[PDB]
Amino acid sequence: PNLFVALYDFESRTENTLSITKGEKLRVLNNTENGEWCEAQTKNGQGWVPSNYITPVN
């Protein structure tokens, strides 16, 4: 399973981060080795987001 929902708005100016909105659904493609960042996919594209900004959806 890899479906999540955003807990908060997140946006960074750094390249390769994805902007997400609270309540938006997303899928996680990859995980960093310390579990702190997730590579997310939404209708707005692909990019990294903090893992503590998302939570699973069954």
Numbering used by the authors: 63 to 120
What is the paper's account of this structure, in its own sentences?
This domain is present in many proteins and regulates critical cellular pathways by recognizing polyproline-rich motifs (PRMs; Kurochkina & Guha, 2013). Three-dimensional domain swapping (3D-DS) is a mechanism by which some proteins can oligomerize by exchanging identical domains or structural elements between monomers. In previous work, the 3D-DS of the c-Src SH3 domain has been characterized and its dependence on experimental conditions has been described.
However, the interchange of one or two loops within the Abl SH3 domain produces a noticeable reduction in its stability but does not promote the formation of 3D domain-swapped oligomers. Conversely, replacing the RT and n-Src loop residues in the Abl_Src chimeras with those from the c-Src SH3 domain results in destabilization under identical denaturing conditions. Notably, the Abl_Src-nSrc and Abl_Src-2 chimeras exhibit pronounced destabilization, highlighting a key role for the c-Src n-Src loop residues in determining the stability of these chimeric proteins. In this way, the ΔG values are the same for the WT and Abl_Src-RT, but the Abl_Src-nSrc and Abl_Src-2 chimeras show a noticeable loss of stability. However, Src_Abl-nSrc shows an ordered distal loop in most of the molecules in the asymmetric unit and this chimera does not form the intertwined dimer. Indeed, even though the Abl_Src chimeras are less stable, this reduction in stability does not allow formation of the intertwined dimer.
